[PDB]
Amino acid sequence: QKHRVAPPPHVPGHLIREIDAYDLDGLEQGFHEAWKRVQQPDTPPLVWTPFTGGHWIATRGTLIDEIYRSPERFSSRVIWVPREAGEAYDMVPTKLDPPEHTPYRKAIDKGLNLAEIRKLEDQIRTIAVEIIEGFADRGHCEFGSEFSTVFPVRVFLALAGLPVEDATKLGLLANEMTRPSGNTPEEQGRSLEAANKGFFEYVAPIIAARRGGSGTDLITRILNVEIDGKPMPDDRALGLVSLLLLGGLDTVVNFLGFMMIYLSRHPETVAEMRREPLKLQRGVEELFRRFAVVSDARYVVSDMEFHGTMLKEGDLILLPTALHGLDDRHHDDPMTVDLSRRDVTHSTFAQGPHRCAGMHLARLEVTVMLQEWLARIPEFRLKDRAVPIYHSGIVAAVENIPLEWEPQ
Numbered sequence: 313q314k315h316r317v318a319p320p321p322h323v324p325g326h327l328i329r330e331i332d333a334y335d336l337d338g339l340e341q342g343f344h345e346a347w348k349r350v351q352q353p354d355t356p357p358l359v360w361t362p363f364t365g366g367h368w369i370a371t372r373g374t375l376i377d378e379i380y381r382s383p384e385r386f387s388s389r390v391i392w393v394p395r396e397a398g399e400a401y402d403m404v405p406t407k408l409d410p411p412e413h414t415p416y417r418k419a420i421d422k423g424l425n426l427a428e429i430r431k432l433e434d435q436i437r438t439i440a441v442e443i444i445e446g447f448a449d450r451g452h453c454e455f456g457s458e459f460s461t462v463f464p465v466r467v468f469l470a471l472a473g474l475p476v477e478d479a480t481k482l483g484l485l486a487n488e489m490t491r492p493s494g495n496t497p498e499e500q501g502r503s504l505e506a507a508n509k510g511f512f513e514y515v516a517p518i519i520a521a522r523r524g525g526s527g528t529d530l531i532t533r534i535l536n537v538e539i540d541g542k543p544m545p546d547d548r549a550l551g552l553v554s555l556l557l558l559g560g561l562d563t564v565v566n567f568l569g570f571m572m573i574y575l576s577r578h579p580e581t582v583a584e585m586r587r588e589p590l591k592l593q594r595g596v597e598e599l600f601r602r603f604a605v606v607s608d609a610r611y612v613v614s615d616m617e618f619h620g621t622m623l624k625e626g627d628l629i630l631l632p633t634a635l636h637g638l639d640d641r642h643h644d645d646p647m648t649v650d651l652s653r654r655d656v657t658h659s660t661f662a663q664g665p666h667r668c669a670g671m672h673l674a675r676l677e678v679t680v681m682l683q684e685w686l687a688r689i690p691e692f693r694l695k696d697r698a699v700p701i702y703h704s705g706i707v708a709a710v711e712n713i714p715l716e717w718e719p720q
């Protein structure tokens with residue numbers, strides 16, 4: 313049964329579209345394909361859905377980019393749908409607007425800036441090689457369970473100085489953050505609340521132990537950056553360390569699954585990467601354009617007209633980031649990975665003050681992954697008649713990616 317809310321008075325019938333972000337029409341064909349169904353040639357730039365508590369969806373890249381760049385008009389006070397889940401959400405600094413946001417982002421950047429991430433290349437490579445060597449000679453693997461859910465998790469837990477045995481419990485919490493269970497807005501709100509509490513419970517003892525600590529791990533480093541000349545308060549620290557884990561452990565996992573399904577179906581593209589290693593390196597941003605996974609929201613600060621659409625204070629707008637990178641008004645043949653594409657502009661990492669703090673780490677993990685994969689498994693395909701299984705929500709997911717090759 314589908315839960316609908318009635319449109320508010322300011323939403324005209326001609327803008328209503330029945331779009332379920334948590335179970336997109338056509339999702340069985342793929343997450344990106346399903347979002348692309350929404351972006352028809354004449355669809356309005358903003359449409360309103362009665363599902364998921366009732367909310368707007370931006371359907372074109374220029375709006376998505378603009379909204380993310382405009383915190384004074386589109387606030388992060390709520391960035392999840394349904395609203396109940398967005399009100400429960402307590403992660404830092406994603407829930408903050410400038411100026412409150414900026415010292416927290418500065419603290420994170422001390423740990424995640426490009427120069428710091430470059431130091432991690434070798435550690436990341438060792439992890440990738442170890443995993444790949446486990447199955448390269450075999451001629452097959454289930455890429456989800458045997459690689460994409462393993463590699464970024466081992467990388468991040470090592471970087472954070474946390475035990476790899478905590479991977480399962482943390483992944484379960486992440487799932488309920490980004491794809492909360494339930495079929496009513498209130499149920500999904502409760503699910504997110506419970507997940508967010510689980511993260512806080514996990515991180516609290518770590519924070520208490522690492523304040524003033526001598527560890528060189530990511531958490532100690534960021535935690536101990538002063539905020540306006542004093543130690544970071546507990547409330548903020550809980551949300552901050554939780555967000556590191558949420559971003560660090562989930563997002564790259566699912567990005568890799570989408571990417572690899574595509575590459576397994578496009579051996580010509582793989583061959584280009586193998587023949588031209590600089591094309592691989594320089595082409596990673598094109599992969600980010602093509603395989604967006606986040607669809608999150610902003611809160612309309614004031615009654616306004618935006619792109620010819622009347623918005624009321626408190627309205628939520630979902631920003632399906634795939635609809636920027638894949639917008640045919642921004643990129644010709646958008647579903648094609650073209651490693652030499654000069655304009656790769658996208659909002660896979662969003663825009664504006666919150667533009668992904670982990671983007672350098674994400675890029676490095678993907679680059680190293682492709683390098684070490686192709687070194688050992690240069691050619692590969694998706695098993696005949698295999699059907700990956702897709703999930704939509706605030707972060708997309710995919711499972712069942714059986715790959716096959718002739719061992720080299």
Ligand code: HEM
Nearest residue numbers: 405406556559560563564567606661662666668669670674
């Ligand atoms: C494929 C990989 C990734 C994608 C697509 C991605 C995407 C995003 C997006 C869209 C945002 C903006 C959220 C918003 O404000 O609405 C964001 C923020 C953030 N991401 Fe990522 N992310 C990725 C990997 C990572 C990694 C590996 C980390 C490491 C912890 C990370 C940490 C963060 C943090 C801390 C923020 C909040 C920044 C702020 O509020 O100023 N992300 N990410």
